Design an enzyme around this catalytic site. Structure first.
Site, PDB file in Angstrom:
ATOM      1  N   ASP A 195       0.815  -1.206   0.000  1.00 38.82           N
ATOM      2  CA  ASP A 195       0.000   0.000   0.000  1.00 38.82           C
ATOM      3  C   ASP A 195       0.848   1.255   0.000  1.00 38.82           C
ATOM      4  O   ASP A 195       1.239   1.727   1.087  1.00 38.82           O
ATOM      5  CB  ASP A 195      -0.931   0.016   1.234  1.00 38.82           C
ATOM      6  CG  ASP A 195      -1.940   1.174   1.195  1.00 38.82           C
ATOM      7  OD1 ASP A 195      -1.874   2.011   0.257  1.00 38.82           O
ATOM      8  OD2 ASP A 195      -2.787   1.254   2.106  1.00 38.82           O
ATOM      9  N   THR A 196       1.100   1.813  -1.198  1.00 35.25           N
ATOM     10  CA  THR A 196       1.976   2.992  -1.336  1.00 35.25           C
ATOM     11  C   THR A 196       1.351   4.264  -0.710  1.00 35.25           C
ATOM     12  O   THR A 196       2.046   5.263  -0.454  1.00 35.25           O
ATOM     13  CB  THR A 196       2.350   3.282  -2.817  1.00 35.25           C
ATOM     14  OG1 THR A 196       1.158   3.493  -3.575  1.00 35.25           O
ATOM     15  CG2 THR A 196       3.143   2.118  -3.436  1.00 35.25           C
ATOM     16  N   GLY A 197       0.047   4.218  -0.447  1.00 38.02           N
ATOM     17  CA  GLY A 197      -0.613   5.373   0.164  1.00 38.02           C
ATOM     18  C   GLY A 197      -0.589   5.368   1.686  1.00 38.02           C
ATOM     19  O   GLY A 197      -1.194   6.226   2.319  1.00 38.02           O
TER      20      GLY A 197
HETATM   21  C1  LIG Z   1      -6.770   1.518   4.254  1.00 36.09           C
HETATM   22  C2  LIG Z   1      -6.682   1.029   2.814  1.00 36.09           C
HETATM   23  C3  LIG Z   1      -7.010  -0.450   2.777  1.00 36.09           C
HETATM   24  C4  LIG Z   1      -7.563   1.842   1.849  1.00 36.09           C
HETATM   25  N1  LIG Z   1      -7.210   3.278   1.933  1.00 36.09           N
HETATM   26  C5  LIG Z   1      -6.117   3.680   1.020  1.00 36.09           C
HETATM   27  C6  LIG Z   1      -4.854   3.852   1.884  1.00 36.09           C
HETATM   28  O1  LIG Z   1      -3.648   3.885   1.095  1.00 36.09           O
HETATM   29  C7  LIG Z   1      -4.966   5.106   2.766  1.00 36.09           C
HETATM   30  C8  LIG Z   1      -4.872   6.370   1.915  1.00 36.09           C
HETATM   31  C9  LIG Z   1      -4.881   7.598   2.790  1.00 36.09           C
HETATM   32  C10 LIG Z   1      -3.674   8.254   3.050  1.00 36.09           C
HETATM   33  C11 LIG Z   1      -3.680   9.391   3.852  1.00 36.09           C
HETATM   34  C12 LIG Z   1      -4.874   9.867   4.384  1.00 36.09           C
HETATM   35  C13 LIG Z   1      -6.078   9.210   4.118  1.00 36.09           C
HETATM   36  C14 LIG Z   1      -6.084   8.070   3.315  1.00 36.09           C
HETATM   37  N2  LIG Z   1      -3.809   5.115   3.659  1.00 36.09           N
HETATM   38  C15 LIG Z   1      -3.875   4.917   4.985  1.00 36.09           C
HETATM   39  O2  LIG Z   1      -4.912   4.684   5.611  1.00 36.09           O
HETATM   40  O3  LIG Z   1      -2.607   4.979   5.695  1.00 36.09           O
HETATM   41  C16 LIG Z   1      -2.608   5.115   7.117  1.00 36.09           C
HETATM   42  C17 LIG Z   1      -1.425   4.287   7.582  1.00 36.09           C
HETATM   43  O4  LIG Z   1      -0.297   5.134   7.366  1.00 36.09           O
HETATM   44  C18 LIG Z   1      -0.675   6.511   7.483  1.00 36.09           C
HETATM   45  O5  LIG Z   1      -0.290   7.255   6.323  1.00 36.09           O
HETATM   46  C19 LIG Z   1      -1.381   8.036   5.833  1.00 36.09           C
HETATM   47  C20 LIG Z   1      -2.632   7.649   6.613  1.00 36.09           C
HETATM   48  C21 LIG Z   1      -2.195   6.519   7.530  1.00 36.09           C
HETATM   49  S1  LIG Z   1      -8.510   4.248   1.868  1.00 36.09           S
HETATM   50  O6  LIG Z   1      -8.126   5.605   1.598  1.00 36.09           O
HETATM   51  O7  LIG Z   1      -9.106   4.162   3.179  1.00 36.09           O
HETATM   52  C22 LIG Z   1      -9.637   3.803   0.808  1.00 36.09           C
HETATM   53  C23 LIG Z   1     -10.751   3.104   1.268  1.00 36.09           C
HETATM   54  C24 LIG Z   1     -11.769   2.709   0.395  1.00 36.09           C
HETATM   55  C25 LIG Z   1     -11.676   3.002  -0.960  1.00 36.09           C
HETATM   56  N3  LIG Z   1     -12.675   2.599  -1.797  1.00 36.09           N
HETATM   57  C26 LIG Z   1     -10.562   3.708  -1.432  1.00 36.09           C
HETATM   58  C27 LIG Z   1      -9.547   4.116  -0.550  1.00 36.09           C
END
Ligand SMILES: CC(C)CN(C[C@@H](O)[C@H](Cc1ccccc1)NC(=O)O[C@H]1CO[C@H]2OCC[C@H]21)S(=O)(=O)c1ccc(N)cc1
Lengths: 99, 99
Positions: free
Chosen positions: B25-27
């Protein structure tokens, strides 16, 4: 090009007539941006991730410009604390993971 | 190895002597799994996700095995709907985005 993950993989996007920064996000099935005015009709959509869930609006066949690549994609608009480029768009630019 | 994004990038992970699946998960800055017993001390942590903010336990220096690679990393435990492999782990195994 190739992008390391020592920093967040943010890219500049144009959508549809506005400039945004967004996260290249392999954990997202879908592409979601903060509230902005996309023109035309939309369908209601709920999505959930970490920390809960949002009500979003689904816009289909939205022009998006990412690096040099123009694609036409589904784009969700709703509360997200960061704009996210999901697999639906990344597949279209031929983006892969490598190690 | 190269991973396309037509499908979710799930990998098999060994963490805390247990086997599970997780998303590359690059996000995500951080690595987070569903409730499991990791041994020892932990720190309370705020994350905020799409829907967050939320309550997680931070375990430092946890052994993780992914795709042959053994790393020792910070791992968050909390009520996420998919287990997530974040950039903190992906950089260690040398994962890049390419297009
Ligand atoms: C949790 C994942 C399975 C899915 N998420 C994408 C994910 O990459 C989010 C994307 C993301 C990133 C930043 C802010 C909100 C969402 N990142 C994330 O939750 O990371 C958390 C852990 O490390 C921290 O870094 C950033 C937030 C923390 S998500 O944004 O919730 C998401 C959920 C449902 C859909 N349909 C599309 C996207």
């Amino acid at each position: 090009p190739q992008i390391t993950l020592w920093q967040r993989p943010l890219v500049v996007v144009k959508v549809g007539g506005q400039l945004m920064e967004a996260l290249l996000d392999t954990g997202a099935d879908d592409t979601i941006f903060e509230e902005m005015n996309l023109p035309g009709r939309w369908t209601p959509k709920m999505i959930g991730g970490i920390g809960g869930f949002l009500n979003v609006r689904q816009y289909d066949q939205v022009p998006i410009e990412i690096c040099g690549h123009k694609v036409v994609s589904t784009v969700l608009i709703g509360p997200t604390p960061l704009n996210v480029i999901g697999r639906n768009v990344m597949t279209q630019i031929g983006c892969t993971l490598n190690f």
